[PDB]
Design an enzyme around this catalytic site. Sequence first.
Site, PDB file in Angstrom:
ATOM      1  N   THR A  98       0.852  -1.223   0.000  1.00 38.27           N
ATOM      2  CA  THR A  98       0.000   0.000   0.000  1.00 38.27           C
ATOM      3  C   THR A  98       0.870   1.249   0.000  1.00 38.27           C
ATOM      4  O   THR A  98       1.750   1.399   0.846  1.00 38.27           O
ATOM      5  CB  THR A  98      -0.932   0.049   1.229  1.00 38.27           C
ATOM      6  N   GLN A  99       0.618   2.137  -0.958  1.00 39.58           N
ATOM      7  CA  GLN A  99       1.292   3.427  -1.016  1.00 39.58           C
ATOM      8  C   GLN A  99       0.263   4.519  -1.299  1.00 39.58           C
ATOM      9  O   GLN A  99      -0.946   4.289  -1.227  1.00 39.58           O
ATOM     10  CB  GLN A  99       2.386   3.454  -2.103  1.00 39.58           C
TER      11      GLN A  99
END
Lengths: 212, 226, 196, 196, 222, 233, 204, 125, 195, 195
Positions: F1-2
């Site tokens: 996740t970014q």
Amino acid sequence: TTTLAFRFQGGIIVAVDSRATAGNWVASQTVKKVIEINPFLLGTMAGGAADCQFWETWLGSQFRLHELREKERISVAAASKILSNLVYQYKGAGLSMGTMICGYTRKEGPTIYYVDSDGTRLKGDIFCVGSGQTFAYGVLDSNYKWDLSVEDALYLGKRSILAAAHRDAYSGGSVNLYHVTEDGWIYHGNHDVGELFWKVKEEEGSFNNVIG
Amino acid sequence: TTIVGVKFNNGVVIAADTRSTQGPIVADKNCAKLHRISPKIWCAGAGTAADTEAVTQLIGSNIELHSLYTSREPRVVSALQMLKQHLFKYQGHIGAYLIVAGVDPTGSHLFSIHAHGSTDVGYYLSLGSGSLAAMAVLESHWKQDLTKEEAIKLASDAIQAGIWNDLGSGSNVDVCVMEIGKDAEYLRNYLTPNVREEKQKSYKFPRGTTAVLKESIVNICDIQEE
Amino acid sequence: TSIMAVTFKDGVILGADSRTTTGAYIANRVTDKLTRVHDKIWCCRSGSAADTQAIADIVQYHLELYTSQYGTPSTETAASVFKELCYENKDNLTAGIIVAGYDDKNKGEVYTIPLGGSVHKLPYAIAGSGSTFIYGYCDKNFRENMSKEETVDFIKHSLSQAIKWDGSSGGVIRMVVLTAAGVERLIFYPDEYEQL
Amino acid sequence: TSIMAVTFKDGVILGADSRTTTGAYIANRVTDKLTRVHDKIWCCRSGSAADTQAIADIVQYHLELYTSQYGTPSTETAASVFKELCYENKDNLTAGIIVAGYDDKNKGEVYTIPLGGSVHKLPYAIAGSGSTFIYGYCDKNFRENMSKEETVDFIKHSLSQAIKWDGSSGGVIRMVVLTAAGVERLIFYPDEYEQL
Amino acid sequence: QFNPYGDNGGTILGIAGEDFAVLAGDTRNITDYSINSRYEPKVFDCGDNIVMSANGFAADGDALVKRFKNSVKWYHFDHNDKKLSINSAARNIQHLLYGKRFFPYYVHTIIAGLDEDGKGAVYSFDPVGSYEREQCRAGGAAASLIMPFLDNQVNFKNQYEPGTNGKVKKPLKYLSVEEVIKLVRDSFTSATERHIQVGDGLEILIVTKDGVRKEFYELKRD
Amino acid sequence: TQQPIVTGTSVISMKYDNGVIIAADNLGSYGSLLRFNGVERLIPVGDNTVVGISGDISDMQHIERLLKDLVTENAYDNPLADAEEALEPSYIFEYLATVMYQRRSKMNPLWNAIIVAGVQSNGDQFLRYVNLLGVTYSSPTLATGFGAHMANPLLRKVVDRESDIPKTTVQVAEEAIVNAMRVLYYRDARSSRNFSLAIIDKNTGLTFKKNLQVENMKWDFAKDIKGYGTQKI
Amino acid sequence: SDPSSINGGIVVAMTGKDCVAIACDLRLGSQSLGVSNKFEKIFHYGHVFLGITGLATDVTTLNEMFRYKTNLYKLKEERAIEPETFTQLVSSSLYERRFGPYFVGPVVAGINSKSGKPFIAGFDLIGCIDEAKDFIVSGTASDQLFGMCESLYEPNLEPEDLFETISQALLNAADRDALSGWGAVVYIIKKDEVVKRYLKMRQD
Amino acid sequence: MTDRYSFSLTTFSPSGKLGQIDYALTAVKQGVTSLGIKATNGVVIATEKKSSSPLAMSETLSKVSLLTPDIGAVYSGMGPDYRVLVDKSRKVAHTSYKRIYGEYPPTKLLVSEVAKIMQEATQSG
Amino acid sequence: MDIILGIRVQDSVILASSKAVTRGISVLKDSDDKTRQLSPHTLMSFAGEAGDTVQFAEYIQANIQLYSIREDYELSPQAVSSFVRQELAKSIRSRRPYQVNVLIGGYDKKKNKPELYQIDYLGTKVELPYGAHGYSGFYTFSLLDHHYRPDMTTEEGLDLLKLCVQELEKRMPMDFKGVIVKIVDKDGIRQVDDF
Amino acid sequence: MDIILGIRVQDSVILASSKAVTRGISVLKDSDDKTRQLSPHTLMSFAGEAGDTVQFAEYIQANIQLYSIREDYELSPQAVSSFVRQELAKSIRSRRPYQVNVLIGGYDKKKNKPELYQIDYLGTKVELPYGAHGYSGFYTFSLLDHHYRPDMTTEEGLDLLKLCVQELEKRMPMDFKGVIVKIVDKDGIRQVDDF
Ligand SMILES: [Mg+2]
Ligand SMILES: [Mg+2]
Ligand SMILES: [Mg+2]
Ligand SMILES: [Mg+2]
Ligand SMILES: [Mg+2]
Ligand SMILES: [Mg+2]
């Protein structure tokens, strides 16, 4: 959901409702909440439908391997403990299971084990699981005797599901009846709650509050 | 919802689709989104449907009393000012997003109003979930000095873009044309490009199909004489 | 938003872009952010459009009532009324206003009123999201007592850069010139200022 | 932080302020943000000091090992190694690095690597908190093929403004000049650049 | 935060006849209030006279269908080109779904075909693999709009024989493929009117002993 | 996740009688900052495919390298690498679609929306979409981000269904695309005037147009607009 | 938790040829627990009929409120209120509680005594009027009702045909909703006679 | 300040007369003649425009006033009192009726509301 | 508090209410009477949040006693139940609502009929042949559904009530310390002191 | 589960454990034996989270039975309690700890002494004359502090235990459905079938 199972003179009665809901939406009225593990063993479905189906089907595979290796019918004790040990490994992962493992063997006689996704394993004479369990318990407790006939025991299980089906919003559709003997379980039909309610109301004189 | 407003030569036209929804469900397939503030001041609403209807009736009511008090025909700037100050006071809690259009002794006008009380001036405007689809059409075909016939065409084409491409919009196109020195003409269901096809089957039941427990006459009449 | 007001020899000039956004959607590409509270007292609006419109409308009311009683108000007086509203209602407002006006006695004056509701009298002021990108440019290029043409070029070049880098700013560059001669509106289109 | 790298006729010049803050406390007022990963490949560091130091040290190691095997690396190669580290570890890094170098074949080159770990080859690059305030100035004043003296003035004036407006930037203006002639360090003190 | 799931809308409908089975689905694909495609096939012929649709999150839907088609292929390799029976396919799909019990395929899967006695068969799955042979099953966005209608018009629920007044139920007479298709079309026409995510086109796959046949019908595009 | 850092906005595209057109502006935004003005977001693969990418630019550059690597790999031990066994648009798309869905399934997505435009060996038009979720769909017109809301409605007026494709010429299709790019420049706050446009025709091949600009803009009407309601001056 | 689905229940209204029909289930519950099978949700003030779904306390409160208001209306106006006028009264009354609303889904049904025109109307909890020609639905099985009505309904049905349509629409919708059922009532309304029919349905 | 007249200025005299009402009726008697006639398909109301001066524009003074689209009013007596009553009558037609029932009040009920306002000025402080 | 039951038989209404009062960890009392006589032929039992229950019950009692004195007349059970419902319906949108559920058992002397009204804290009123609040119904309603007849005697009602209490004592986790049972009929209100 | 008590008297250890098994709303069982025989002269009662309790108890049982066979020798109660403590101390820093509290009642045949060990889920071991887990001690310890003597007979211990249970039945809100009592002495383990 309403599922029950109780031990008696003639073996075990297993009775379940048929309703499945997603919130207020009635997804199905024709759900099978009795898993036919094998011809001798039955399991009930409450909580997670997939979890009960999958693992009690898997269950039948383990029992089949047991009796192939050991050349002997698996005990209800060993049977239920395979399931409870399995779900206990998954404890915390989020399995949802409330089931009665029901069987009738030589060494044990008619035996019922309540098995739980928290790892609970309880031997007992009467068990009721589901959103309508409290309603079914009332009818069971007040009318249960060990010396019930197979006919009266079957009706008691049917009537107790009907009690729950009526009051519990998340129970209904139809009633499935099973009778577990030493030589195996015997299916005693699908009974629509709609038709059963009016039939029971008239013949029994119960549900006077309801206009028919 | 798709609502648009388009200025033209001698007036202004507003248009709207006719679909009102509760979530993904279509509540009314032929909703009337074009509301009257005064005879020649009309507005189209998007957002909370009760708020758009309620706020236009309130201002429309006060506009009528103001018109009677001043012996003058109501102005769009008055409706605009009364709407924005009301909406601003309630800090966006009244979810009314309006395109206000009309003609008055000052001339023809077109404004948009957002729920927090901000207003904008323009020659072409669009509001609602289908505003981007509609604005795409307006930006592609709008020009200065549109005729009445061109503006109606452009306005309804912009609503159609919303109808077809926006799931929040659908059904029919309502139009109202407000021209200077003329009665405003409300064109209910100006376009009807979404009539349901005939069903494959009739579902009229045989009489006596339904099971009945009791019948009785309901007394709707008052207490009788004698 | 990119807005500024610059004092010069003959008076003051207000400048602004015309972009109003709701997220990344340009809700209005031809917005008029230069708003009139009195004949020769105008303001540049940044922040909540609802708030700054509501404030400006109230100020215009106050200066109109002031004029009826006490004659033409000073630019300082207009800034004070803006400040009073912005400061006392700081918890419920998101308004960044630059006040600019022309007296004959005081000539061109610029007051900036940031979020807190403080007042700062300046030779020139810049504000809005796009102003961040031209602090360096404006500081290096501003001179006092510029001519009208120089000030127009300074504002045009400044807002051109603000628009170039700030996605929230864009459209046309509007300007309002305040002098003894009167009130002059100016507009400059993308094809003009982008090639600068 | 205010950092930049500018290509010019004879090569490239890296520029930086010297302020390092922990909140509002200036932890180091004489920081050297211009760091050497190879003889004529340097970088400007912004973001987490720990991260950018760790990255630079790893790059220096990689280019040292590269040189032992394959000879002098290109500036593009150095930028690629920076990018590889920044991109692959984007979840755990806060690094904004400008890579600048001088080849004889390619001459002066500048690569900027922002937070995401993308690479952008540019004639000049600006970065750090203080860069926001000089986008306008740098865009208006940058020319290609400037002289050494012009580029030094451009960087000095740019970072002077960045420092003036950004509280996170300040101290001395350090610069490193990369040409065929070699590597020249320059320093400029507050009394010099503040009066510009 | 990254949300690995999405809702691509759509509505599917499986009906089991006496010697046939239909699996229908609208061809509209959406996100939020936008249309991605007016024709994106959702019901698939998977070989061995089995049709499948995995409605909901289209990426998981496509992944599951792809893996099942793959399972059919490997079933042939491993078991001497034996035909995968609908019941065996159903059990296999349970394991595919339950395999991702703790990161589910966000779909409501329905398959249709014929059982080993040649009778019409439809199987219905939840996201994590609990499945069930059914006569009638709508899935997806407008499932709540369609199922009550099917209870009434297929199973004749709440319908009694005139004159008896609730004493004799309407008899459950068998429906022909032409009769089923009429109910499917009217179900989707009604769903299109009242559900914003339903529209554009209706694609029906009909399964018989002769094979798999396709029928397409237009739906309202608003 | 970014979270996406440097981003590219709308990619728009459509089919016409002999092929496909795809377009995307040359902007790499850094939030509201219009940071990078020379970013090419249309990446050709061979002479039959153009991959248009929106969203995170660092992930775009990674994808760009994967496609470059794909061409190299396809040429290995392949005498027909420039003929029968050349990369098809369908091969390139399915590969990306696999990667996108795999990456979302590891909870580490490539933060992009991709449109693969091209022409197959048999002359068939290929146009298909894939994004960070691994969601895929095809349509006569496809657009990402703001393009989906504003470009599609305009492009769908030209090609409203499959049967309109043979009736649409390359001149009409390009005109519609260019107009849509103007509309996006008016209304998308994260767009630029400069864009690239690519045409993949089954007869004339790949035509890649760089440094295009939005022109014929309407702004004159702005002069007449004054205040926000009551203001006359 | 959700006030509009604690007690459950549904109302549906339809227009026919020179007639209207309004129908409701009889269930009142506390979520899963069934509490009453005699909770009628349809009321009438003169010849104007009002169905109300949602939170049961508000259903009762609003009935008492509209009885109150239509009684004063009649005393002052010297005539019974009409469906069109009452619809506006319901809308006004709901919107005055804009930021503290009654959690209900009202449905008006009736025939205008002067014009003889059949009329139906629906509202959201906050007062927005849905004046449909064909049908109005409300309650916890409103989706199901929309599905049933949309397929079963055809215009200009005769009173005794309309009865069958609205009954089947209600029954089959309620049987797909856990919180609806436990009996049902159907009103068939003509200009000067109203017939009320209790339906036989499954009691689960 | 404050309105310290919180007591009735109209009171019953020993004879049972309400003086201020009688005196108000005397003022009405001095007022210019106005009349009303009801027909089968309409009503007419009429009065004389008694112009106070020929320089005055008597068109600007409206003795006959629209209250609702279907209701009109005319008077005899004090004009200023009439004017404010028309304002109140117009507003009360909206506030106590149109904003509730979505339609204009019937004649008798609007009359009732006007009568209530005039009654209150006969008893209030 | 916990369990309150009600059953309307032929000629009377029977209310059964638990005796336990638990404050957290300890049972402070095992003889608490959760009921108030509103009028000679109207009894109200109650259960809900501590303090609110008794405050509300006594407030209602005072109001009905006031009405009785003013008019020299006993309000019908229906009239009392409507008054109570309105107070609770008023309460639910207050600053701090009464968290109280009640059963109103009354004998209507005019109609010569027993009447049982069930009202929850929201103001949800229902007239029933038998009723309960909280979880009490979950255990008891299946028994009541089965055995209940509208022509039951008071003695039969008490026997059915005992069966309900026995089921509660078996399957409920909480010890509610038995129930106080009261009968409302034409002669008034009386307590069954042995149960 | 709920209540588990232990008391070490002159020549034996007595463990009392509740029979109720409640899963949320209903009491599923009223005859549950919350104990396992680890060795002929060592008994362990247990209470804690569902599933974990029995899993842990049987795991310990198996290990002690294994040791007994391998060495042909019964471990002392002290040795068993130390083994059990270590397993719980190991458990508390695991991925998912055993949520189980235990009492270990054993008779040391070497020393000819009864021994009671109290161990909580953290691995907190204490040797006591009398012990409990959860809230059980809050009600019972004041009685045990008063009446307990180290020279009590088994019959006196049972009488003091009855008084403890009576106090629990009076003041505890939960119905724990009585207790199963077991005695551990030189002759081994036996159950008191009437209590
Ligand atoms: Mg039920
Ligand atoms: Mg605000
Ligand atoms: Mg811009
Ligand atoms: Mg649709
Ligand atoms: Mg139901
Ligand atoms: Mg209640």
